[PDB]
Amino acid sequence: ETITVPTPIKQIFSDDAFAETIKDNLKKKSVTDAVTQNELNSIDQIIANNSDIKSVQGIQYLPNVTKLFLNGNKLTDIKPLANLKNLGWLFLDENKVKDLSSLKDLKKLKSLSLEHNGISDINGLVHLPQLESLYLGNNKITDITVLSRLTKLDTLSLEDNQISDIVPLAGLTKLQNLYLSKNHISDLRALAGLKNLDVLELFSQECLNKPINHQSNLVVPNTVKNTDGSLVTPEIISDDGDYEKPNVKWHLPEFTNEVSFIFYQPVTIGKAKARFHGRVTQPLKEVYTVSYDVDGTVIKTKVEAGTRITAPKPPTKQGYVFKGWYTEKNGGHEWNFNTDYMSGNDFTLYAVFKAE
């Protein structure tokens, strides 16, 4: 990883955009100009944001780089970084970098920015417990279990992700700046002990409940909790709903597949002021009851409209032969379970028998 003769910049740095970056850093006239290892050793910092760079191949010949600004490029592989032992600041916003394993030996890294990279798996960050700043906004992260090992972070941005479980942050008492907006957070109890916060953002939380059946009189528990576990009063409720603590209630005379409510709660933690803001969405299934009548005795089961009915075990009446399930006791037509789907209303099916 060392050149032994003067070598043109373009020969080492194969990406045309990155070659111009080295030329400009060294104040050279052309990417064809020859450079020496002593000149490469002199590079402490590279600033090449928004420069259409696809590859940093060649950077492994720069042992003394401590600061690397590469926001807004087209990078995917970062393996050439693997042995830059003195790298302290790495900014890789707006790329497509997913293989964080190349970072595992960068033990002097103090600041890491990886926003807008499509990342979901951050487990590779376990090898960087010394990090002080971490920017992971605009990604697809759900599991932040690993962050309990990052006990040196004072700055953490996780905004615009898919996080619901923030329990791994509870012990990270060094945090001073914490950006968590645009996530799925409904329970702030994990934040209660972060007494050193100065800046906190908690806006636009989208919280999705598991679906329940639609009913005429609907009750859904309020699941939004402050740092002390207390319920956050809804800011506004859809469909003319009302808040009857601890439950939100609606009268829905006609079926609808969703209700929702928005919440707002001012929050103070340590010296930090924040606005806890978000929406809880409740999907609803339209279910009705099939009643099976067997000579006056009925069993009822609930079935979603538009789905197939599972036929019950047929009744066995001595001296007769079961013929089918009919829409009326005396008369009507027979229900065909393989092709007729549950209707949008309650109804009864009647067992009919015939003589031997």
Author numbering: 36 to 391
Q: What did the publication describing this PDB structure actually write?
A:
InlB, an invasion protein from the facultative intracellular pathogen Listeria monocytogenes, is a multi-domain protein that binds and activates the human receptor tyrosine kinase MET. The N-terminal internalin domain (amino acids 36–321; InlB321) is characterized by a central leucine-rich repeat (LRR) region that binds to the first Ig-like IPT domain of MET with high affinity. The LRR region is flanked N-terminally by a helical cap and C-terminally by an Ig-like inter-repeat (IR) region. The B repeat folds into a compact domain resembling a β-grasp fold.
Intriguingly, wild-type InlB392 was a much more problematic crystallization target than the InlB392_T332E variant. Crystals only grew in condition E6 of a MORPHEUS screen stored beyond its ‘use by’ date. At 4°C we obtained thin rod-shaped crystals with a cross-section of about 10 × 10 µm and a length of 80–100 µm. The best crystal diffracted to 3.3 Å resolution. The packing of InlB392_T332E crystal form I is closely related to that of InlB392_wt and the surroundings of all three molecules in the wild-type structure are similar. In a way, the packing of InlB392_wt can be viewed as a slightly distorted version of InlB392_T332E crystal form I with a tripled b axis.
